[PDB]
Design an enzyme around this catalytic site. Structure first.
Site, PDB file in Angstrom:
ATOM      1  N   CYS A 227      83.000 -86.364  99.429  1.00  0.00           N
ATOM      2  CA  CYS A 227      83.390 -87.257  98.331  1.00  0.00           C
ATOM      3  C   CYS A 227      83.809 -88.631  98.854  1.00  0.00           C
ATOM      4  O   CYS A 227      84.848 -88.718  99.584  1.00  0.00           O
ATOM      5  CB  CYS A 227      84.574 -86.665  97.573  1.00  0.00           C
ATOM      6  SG  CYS A 227      84.997 -87.631  96.106  1.00  0.00           S
TER       7      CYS A 227
ATOM      8  N   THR B 242      86.249 -85.119  87.220  1.00  0.00           N
ATOM      9  CA  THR B 242      86.849 -84.373  88.352  1.00  0.00           C
ATOM     10  C   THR B 242      88.350 -84.590  88.387  1.00  0.00           C
ATOM     11  O   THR B 242      89.073 -83.581  88.514  1.00  0.00           O
ATOM     12  CB  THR B 242      86.212 -84.735  89.704  1.00  0.00           C
ATOM     13  OG1 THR B 242      86.236 -86.156  89.847  1.00  0.00           O
ATOM     14  CG2 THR B 242      84.793 -84.239  89.840  1.00  0.00           C
TER      15      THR B 242
ATOM     16  N   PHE C   7      86.510 -81.537  98.478  1.00  0.00           N
ATOM     17  CA  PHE C   7      85.792 -82.840  98.516  1.00  0.00           C
ATOM     18  C   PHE C   7      84.478 -82.752  99.319  1.00  0.00           C
ATOM     19  O   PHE C   7      83.873 -83.842  99.671  1.00  0.00           O
ATOM     20  CB  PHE C   7      86.762 -83.881  99.063  1.00  0.00           C
ATOM     21  CG  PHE C   7      87.925 -84.155  98.137  1.00  0.00           C
ATOM     22  CD1 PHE C   7      87.746 -84.872  96.966  1.00  0.00           C
ATOM     23  CD2 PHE C   7      89.201 -83.716  98.452  1.00  0.00           C
ATOM     24  CE1 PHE C   7      88.828 -85.150  96.132  1.00  0.00           C
ATOM     25  CE2 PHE C   7      90.280 -83.986  97.619  1.00  0.00           C
ATOM     26  CZ  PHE C   7      90.091 -84.712  96.464  1.00  0.00           C
TER      27      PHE C   7
HETATM   28  C1  HEM Z   1      89.618 -84.592  92.276  1.00  0.00           C
HETATM   29  C2  HEM Z   1      88.620 -85.484  92.155  1.00  0.00           C
HETATM   30  C3  HEM Z   1      87.318 -85.289  92.807  1.00  0.00           C
HETATM   31  C4  HEM Z   1      86.759 -84.200  93.407  1.00  0.00           C
HETATM   32  C5  HEM Z   1      87.301 -82.802  93.468  1.00  0.00           C
HETATM   33  C6  HEM Z   1      85.489 -84.596  93.935  1.00  0.00           C
HETATM   34  C7  HEM Z   1      84.631 -83.713  94.627  1.00  0.00           C
HETATM   35  C8  HEM Z   1      83.439 -84.086  95.233  1.00  0.00           C
HETATM   36  C9  HEM Z   1      82.617 -83.248  96.020  1.00  0.00           C
HETATM   37  C10 HEM Z   1      82.817 -81.763  96.319  1.00  0.00           C
HETATM   38  C11 HEM Z   1      81.568 -84.010  96.458  1.00  0.00           C
HETATM   39  C12 HEM Z   1      80.404 -83.500  97.310  1.00  0.00           C
HETATM   40  C13 HEM Z   1      79.300 -82.993  96.379  1.00  0.00           C
HETATM   41  C14 HEM Z   1      78.082 -82.403  97.074  1.00  0.00           C
HETATM   42  O1  HEM Z   1      78.076 -82.138  98.309  1.00  0.00           O
HETATM   43  O2  HEM Z   1      77.048 -82.201  96.382  1.00  0.00           O
HETATM   44  C15 HEM Z   1      81.742 -85.324  95.937  1.00  0.00           C
HETATM   45  C16 HEM Z   1      80.851 -86.362  96.147  1.00  0.00           C
HETATM   46  C17 HEM Z   1      81.044 -87.620  95.588  1.00  0.00           C
HETATM   47  N1  HEM Z   1      82.090 -88.022  94.813  1.00  0.00           N
HETATM   48 FE1  HEM Z   1      83.677 -87.020  94.314  1.00  0.00          FE
HETATM   49  N2  HEM Z   1      85.311 -85.878  93.668  1.00  0.00           N
HETATM   50  C18 HEM Z   1      86.363 -86.395  93.042  1.00  0.00           C
HETATM   51  C19 HEM Z   1      86.586 -87.680  92.587  1.00  0.00           C
HETATM   52  C20 HEM Z   1      85.696 -88.745  92.725  1.00  0.00           C
HETATM   53  C21 HEM Z   1      85.896 -90.089  92.332  1.00  0.00           C
HETATM   54  C22 HEM Z   1      87.145 -90.598  91.660  1.00  0.00           C
HETATM   55  C23 HEM Z   1      84.780 -90.817  92.714  1.00  0.00           C
HETATM   56  C24 HEM Z   1      84.374 -92.236  92.465  1.00  0.00           C
HETATM   57  C25 HEM Z   1      84.871 -93.005  91.504  1.00  0.00           C
HETATM   58  C26 HEM Z   1      83.900 -89.868  93.303  1.00  0.00           C
HETATM   59  C27 HEM Z   1      82.649 -90.173  93.800  1.00  0.00           C
HETATM   60  C28 HEM Z   1      81.843 -89.298  94.520  1.00  0.00           C
HETATM   61  C29 HEM Z   1      80.563 -89.762  95.095  1.00  0.00           C
HETATM   62  C30 HEM Z   1      79.923 -91.122  94.943  1.00  0.00           C
HETATM   63  C31 HEM Z   1      80.053 -88.711  95.754  1.00  0.00           C
HETATM   64  C32 HEM Z   1      78.756 -88.760  96.528  1.00  0.00           C
HETATM   65  C33 HEM Z   1      79.122 -89.214  97.957  1.00  0.00           C
HETATM   66  C34 HEM Z   1      77.926 -89.261  98.933  1.00  0.00           C
HETATM   67  O3  HEM Z   1      77.216 -88.254  99.111  1.00  0.00           O
HETATM   68  O4  HEM Z   1      77.641 -90.304  99.568  1.00  0.00           O
HETATM   69  N3  HEM Z   1      84.494 -88.639  93.322  1.00  0.00           N
HETATM   70  N4  HEM Z   1      82.911 -85.363  95.159  1.00  0.00           N
END
Ligand code: HEM
Ligand SMILES: CCCCCCC(=O)N1CCC[C@H]1C(=O)N[C@@H](Cc1ccccc1)C(=O)O
Length: 454
Positions: free
Chosen positions: A399, A267, A392
């Site tokens: 996120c 991402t 996010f």
């Molecule tokens: C520009 C960078 C990133 C974007 C655009 C992004 C985007 C997203 C989005 C849209 C979701 C929600 C997904 C859903 O509803 O199915 C999400 C969930 C998540 N992201 Fe990211 N993400 C990024 C970077 C990261 C990083 C660096 C980490 C961890 C090292 C991370 C860990 C997670 C986790 C663990 C979730 C699940 C959270 C939960 O439901 O409890 N993301 N991300």
């Protein structure tokens, strides 16, 4: 109450062959441009509704009415990410337990502790580009992925993938990329039992085995050590959930690490890649962002406090996220019977897909210039309506990595703009590759050093 439109059908396969493309998200965007703010999409035994308007998305983001759904894509990723935060249902014990334990490790405050590790990897990127010969170019998504993988390895579990020392990815990464490729390919398959897919399924099981064996080995080696570095692995081995009073078990920790490694790789590297693409295509914006980088980053080693001052670099990142959110969709289900937008009755369990790139193009929110790259849209944060901007995702399932990704991206983009001038020497034609995420494939530039010491 209205009937919602539906794109073209293929007899018994309904809409499924519309996904038989290497670029399914861009295909759905074109369908949303044709059909409007909502359309029905049917596959054999599956229906969902794709949302594109802020008007309908703001209702879908009502956590009293809708919860996170695992899309078919996330169900396929769950075969290796298990009940990690990203691929767990809100109602699984391990979701809330991991959420409570990990939230403090991902706070804006926690970024002070990760900053030095992020700087270590950023400096490796700058030194790589400083060391290129005059006739050479940069492979942008390739180097951004080297960086973001290394950053999450070092902040994740004090492990150096040493991506800037190699052509050939680390073994874990070979398995992880191929597993992600399998999970996104399975989606399209007219006939998944077909014998042409036998080798893919055998391989898939092999890659799951590689990812687990190697992450379990780091967990087990870290328990043997007694070692207590300031990484996520330490926080997960020591942390207790205040609700249950329990720590994560070793199996769930392994899913959390695989999950973080997927995020790093996919991402944040996409965001940096798109941001640099829009900067070289928009020289007035590049000048304003490089002015800020040069004025703010006055030390050879950027501080946490200096990265917080890069406001225009942050606006550039938000505007790249608006046009090409690198995680482009999330799925929701109706908790109860409800009516979407006064017009579309839904039953308990019905699925919605949020098409984030389309939300971000809603002219009723952003005005007529929605395809233009204009970071000035984000000058005043409080001018952006609730649920207009969702790179996010949403609510308690948003996120967890958002502060980490934006701290890394602002630090790195700031350093790139301080240290180099950039040329679009090939007049690069945007080609967006779709994996779990969106990245600009084949994007290359030339960097002319400003010859500023590290
Ligand atoms: C520009 C960078 C990133 C974007 C655009 C992004 C985007 C997203 C989005 C849209 C979701 C929600 C997904 C859903 O509803 O199915 C999400 C969930 C998540 N992201 Fe990211 N993400 C990024 C970077 C990261 C990083 C660096 C980490 C961890 C090292 C991370 C860990 C997670 C986790 C663990 C979730 C699940 C959270 C939960 O439901 O409890 N993301 N991300
Ligand atoms: C956090 C970023 C993760 C994005 C996951 C991939 C995704 O959502 N995709 C990748 C393809 C397009 C889009 C989608 O609409 N996915 C649907 C595709 C679909 C499959 C079968 C039937 C109906 C829709 C799904 O996975 O469920």
């Amino acid at each position: 109450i209205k009937e919602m439109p539906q794109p073209k059908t293929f007899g018994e396969l309904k809409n499924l062959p519309l996904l038989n493309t290497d670029k399914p998200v861009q295909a759905l965007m074109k369908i949303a441009d044709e059909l409007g703010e909502i359309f029905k999409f049917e596959a054999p035994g599956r229906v969902t509704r794709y949302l594109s308007s802020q008007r309908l998305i703001k209702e879908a983001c009502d956590e009293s009415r809708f919860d996170k759904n695992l899309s078919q894509a996330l169900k396929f990723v769950r075969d290796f990410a298990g009940d990690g935060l990203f691929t767990s249902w809100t109602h699984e014990k391990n979701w809330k337990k991991a959420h409570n334990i990990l939230l403090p490790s991902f706070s804006q405050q926690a970024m002070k502790g990760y900053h030095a590790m992020m700087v270590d990897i950023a400096v490796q990127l700058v030194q790589k580009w400083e060391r290129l010969n005059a006739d050479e170019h940069i492979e942008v998504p390739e180097d951004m992925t080297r960086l973001t993988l290394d950053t999450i390895g070092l902040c994740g579990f004090n492990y150096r993938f040493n991506s800037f020392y190699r052509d050939q990815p680390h073994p874990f990464i070979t398995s992880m990329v191929r597993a992600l490729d399998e999970a996104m390919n399975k989606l399209q398959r007219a006939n998944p039992d077909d014998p042409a897919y036998d080798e893919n399924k055998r391989q898939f099981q092999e890659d799951i085995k590689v990812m687990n064996d190697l992450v379990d080995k780091i967990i087990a080696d870290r328990k043997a050590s007694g070692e207590q570095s300031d990484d996520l692995l330490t926080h997960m081995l020591n942390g207790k959930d205040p609700e249950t009073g329990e720590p994560l078990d070793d199996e769930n920790i392994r899913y959390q690490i695989i999950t973080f490694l997927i995020a790093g790789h996919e991402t944040t590297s996409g965001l940096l890649s798109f941001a640099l693409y829009f900067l070289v295509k928009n020289p007035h914006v590049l000048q304003k962002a490089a002015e800020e980088a040069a004025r703010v980053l006055v030390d050879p080693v950027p501080s946490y406090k200096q990265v917080k001052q890069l406001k225009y670099v942050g606006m550039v990142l938000n505007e790249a996220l608006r046009l090409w959110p690198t995680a482009p969709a999330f799925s929701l289900y109706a908790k109860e019977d409800t009516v979407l937008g006064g017009e579309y009755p839904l039953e308990k369990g019905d699925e919605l897909m949020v098409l984030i790139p389309q939300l971000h193009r809603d002219k009723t929110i952003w005005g007529d210039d929605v395809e233009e790259f204009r970071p000035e849209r984000f000058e005043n944060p409080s001018a952006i309506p609730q649920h207009a901007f969702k790179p996010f995702g949403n609510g308690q399932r948003a996120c967890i990595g958002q502060q980490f990704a934006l701290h890394e991206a602002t630090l790195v983009l700031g350093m790139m703009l301080k240290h180099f001038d950039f040329e679009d020497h090939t007049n690069y034609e945007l080609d967006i590759k779709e994996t779990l995420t969106l990245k600009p494939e084949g994007f290359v530039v030339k960097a002319k050093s400003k010859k500023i010491p590290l």
